[PDB]
Structure 1
Amino acid sequence: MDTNPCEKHSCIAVIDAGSTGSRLHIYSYDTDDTNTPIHIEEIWNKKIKPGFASIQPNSVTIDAYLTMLLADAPIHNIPVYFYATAGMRLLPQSQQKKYYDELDYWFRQQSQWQLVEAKTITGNDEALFDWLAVNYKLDTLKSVQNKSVGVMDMGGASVQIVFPMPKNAEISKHNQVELNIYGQNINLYVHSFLGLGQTEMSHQFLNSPSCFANDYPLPDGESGQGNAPSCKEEVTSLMNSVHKVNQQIQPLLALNPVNEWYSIGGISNLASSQLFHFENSELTNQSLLQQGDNQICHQQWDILNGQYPDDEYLYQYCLLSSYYYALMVDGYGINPNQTIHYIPPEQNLDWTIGVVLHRAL
């Protein structure tokens, strides 16, 4: 990396304003003969909490939040994309508008950042960016691939799934995108399920004893009595009886098999706990469920809590192990012995590189 990279390369700021927080990235890049970005490098990264949709939509609060997010960035005279996702999607447009009107005013009132867009993106655009970010990192975009790469983004309020699929006139146009990039034409199926991200879905199960370690104090005063297969069947009812995940996804995956699954988001954080034993930054659903059942669901909460003092979300690990299996195996139809790659959690990889690659007409 150069010293003062934005004096030597194009630069853009992309903010991922998700349900749990907002993450600013500044990327430097060069461009190829078609003015498409190459050599994308992250030169700055800053996350603040809580989610933008969780703060009071008044000037003082929104102005303090943007200042906290942006003021200490090393370069400011660059284009900014502020893209909010599932936290903002939980709100009606009239409520979202209060946030964007105040944010727009804050950018208009300063003279360095160059706001391009500030908006709630759809889950479908977000899934496209999920797939572009991962495949950019895997270096599979420049040449036509012989294997199909699927991507899952496991967020706090939505989950996305995205994989190659030829155009299909029986499927909504909203769930398909024809990507042109580096001279190749890519057709993807995209889907986002709102309410199935980990925070939203956990709020359906907090008094389920099967979903928590033995003797964990549940909110209404009963005790955990963990059992991952039982917990998983409860979560599967939300996936398939309420949201119809398997009816929508499985027939398409059977017709368009994915050779390599990659995930970003929450799986990385769970699977990296010392409670688990994985190698090569990959897991299978059967191993995740078995290890969460043995190591967490069937262990005593006070012992776990004292033994893993730096696992902030330890109390949900039995639930999360069970939920990931419900979503991937019972929802998407992925075999429980299929390898799922997870991007190493130190990378904090999100969908933002997708915006660098896709934003131009």
Structure 2
Amino acid sequence: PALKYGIVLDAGSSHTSMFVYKWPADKENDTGIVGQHSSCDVQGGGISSYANDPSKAGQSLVRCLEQALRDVPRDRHASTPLYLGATAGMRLLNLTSPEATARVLEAVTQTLTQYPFDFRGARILSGQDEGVFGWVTANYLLENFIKYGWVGRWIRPRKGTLGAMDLGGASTQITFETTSPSEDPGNEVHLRLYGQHYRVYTHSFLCYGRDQILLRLLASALQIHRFHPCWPKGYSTQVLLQEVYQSPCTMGQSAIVSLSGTSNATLCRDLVSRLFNISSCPFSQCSFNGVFQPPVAGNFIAFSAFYYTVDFLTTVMGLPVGTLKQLEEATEITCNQTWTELQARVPGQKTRLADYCAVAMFIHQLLSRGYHFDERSFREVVFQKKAADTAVGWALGYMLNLTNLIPADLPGLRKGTHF
């Protein structure tokens, strides 16, 4: 059939990626119909890394945009919407300097507006937006919003949805369908998709993203130990304190200090447990830091750094992660490697290598102590980054919303036969 296109730039804290989506022009309202056509990863940091040089943020996008000009056929350029949405890197810069933030949005805007696409704006997503649009992505791709059954015999309970857990660079999101009463309006989400109501919980923990957790652990390690128990014995580095303390995430804790690893799983576990304040709950029950959260229920997909970390544990370390107990053993085993041990298991590039013990430990604690998974509910979590050929993230659901492609109700209401 005739095909339509749309483009999303996911301007995250640590990277920008460009996704081109495509769909049939006359069957564009079907769930699962939109899928990924192509993508491009911008080189270097995310747009917020250019706060002191905002025109470089715009120019960073140029190669991917040239690829978009080749990927979308010329005759459709002018009618292809293009959107940029930015996450916790831009949220954190907006705490630091609303002016620098606005100059970075202005530079990316000026670059984008001179391409021939229907450029529809650069915006900073709220934490709720980022969590919910990821849940829409996952569930749309896997066709969970289809009403299964036939007239006189609908499946009951209605088809379950898949919960979403996103471990980004600067924040982490959890979002799931719940039957529990809502006790905090900032967590409450009601969706009308294809004639049905989904009652959803969402929360974004700013500063609980992977790179921000590593910075807090580094600060905390320097304060309490003057060595890093999560780092492998024999690894060390020259740490620039200004970088540690400038983040809004750490500055609540002279120029260069040497820091070495000790391969101490038990002390690493204790350093990480300080990240989670479970000391009080103004609600009937909480995740952590006083945040309302109903009991986790149903299947979940854990993507982005959940996936990258688990893939290292399984593929590189050779260790199972099928139960929380296995995940915990995998983490101890990893944390107890010397730097020479660890490097010997990775023959290719070592960037990130010293950090897997800390991130795995954070992940095990986040799921068990923070979100209150147990062995029974954890069984229903899968680690994946792709569904039906499309990368899992908030970009697709953002696109679907802004291009108005998921209807609140089916046309003519399917003659009321779903009532």
TM-score range, shorter chain: 0.7 to 0.9
- Asked if structure 2 preserves the Cα contact closer than 8 Å seen for 1:30 and 1:37, the reply is no
- Asked if structure 2 preserves the Cα contact closer than 8 Å seen for 1:123 and 1:192, the reply is yes
How far apart, CA to CA, are the structure 2 residues paired with 1:293 and 1:284?
Answer: 14
How far apart, CA to CA, are the structure 1 residues paired with 2:391 and 2:170?
Answer: 17
**Aligned residues between the structures:** 348
- Where 1:211 maps in the other structure, the secondary structure is strand
Residue identity opposite 1:40 in structure 2: V
1:324 aligned partner: 363
**CA 1:86/1:250 → structure 2, altered by over 3 Å: closer, same or farther?**
closer
- Where 1:71 maps in the other structure, the secondary structure is helix
- Where 2:67 maps in the other structure, the secondary structure is coil
1:89 aligned partner: 91
Stretch of structure 1 that moved more, 93-102 or 32-41: 32-41
2:12 aligned partner: 18
How far apart, CA to CA, are the structure 2 residues paired with 1:169 and 1:297?
Answer: 39
How far apart, CA to CA, are the structure 1 residues paired with 2:358 and 2:4?
Answer: 44
1:196 aligned partner: 208
- Asked if structure 2 preserves the Cα contact closer than 8 Å seen for 1:36 and 1:182, the reply is no
Give 1:155-304 correspondences, 5 Å limit: 155-166=168-179, 168=181, 170-172=183-185, 174-206=186-218, 207=221, 209-217=228-236, 219=239, 220-240=257-277, 246-247=287-288, 252-254=293-295, 257-273=296-312, 274-277=315-318, 283-294=322-333, 296-304=334-342
1:343 aligned partner: 384
Q: CA deviation at 1:35?
A: 4.1
How far apart, CA to CA, are the structure 1 residues paired with 2:179 and 2:290?
Answer: 15
2:151 aligned partner: none
- Where 1:330 maps in the other structure, the secondary structure is helix
How far apart, CA to CA, are the structure 1 residues paired with 2:163 and 2:65?
Answer: 33
Q: Deviations over 1:69-113 (max 9, x none)?
A: 3112222431111000010000223332111222222333x2512
How far apart, CA to CA, are the structure 1 residues paired with 2:318 and 2:26?
Answer: 42
- 5+ residue gaps, structure 2: 149-157, 222-226, 240-256, 405-419
**CA 1:152/1:249 → structure 2, altered by over 3 Å: closer, same or farther?**
farther
Give 1:39-54 correspondences, 5 Å limit: 39-48=33-42, 49-54=44-49
How far apart, CA to CA, are the structure 1 residues paired with 2:54 and 2:213?
Answer: 31
Q: CA deviation at 1:135?
A: 1.4
Residue identity opposite 2:261 in structure 1: G
**CA 1:242/1:315 → structure 2, altered by over 3 Å: closer, same or farther?**
farther
Larger Rg belongs to: 2
**CA 1:135/1:300 → structure 2, altered by over 3 Å: closer, same or farther?**
same
1:333 to 339, 359, 372: 372
Q: CA deviation at 1:348?
A: 4.6
Q: Deviations over 1:303-348 (max 9, x none)?
A: 3213303353121111011000121111111115622211157965
- 5+ residue gaps, structure 1: 3-7
Q: CA deviation at 1:236?
A: 2.4
Normalised to the residue count of structure 2, the TM-score between the two structures is: 0.75
1:5 aligned partner: none
- Asked if structure 2 preserves the Cα contact closer than 8 Å seen for 1:31 and 1:37, the reply is no
How far apart, CA to CA, are the structure 2 residues paired with 1:265 and 1:242?
Answer: 29
How far apart, CA to CA, are the structure 1 residues paired with 2:214 and 2:198?
Answer: 35
Residue identity opposite 2:229 in structure 1: S
Q: CA deviation at 1:211?
A: 0.9
Instruction: State, as a whole percentage, how many aligned pairs show the same letter.
Output: 24
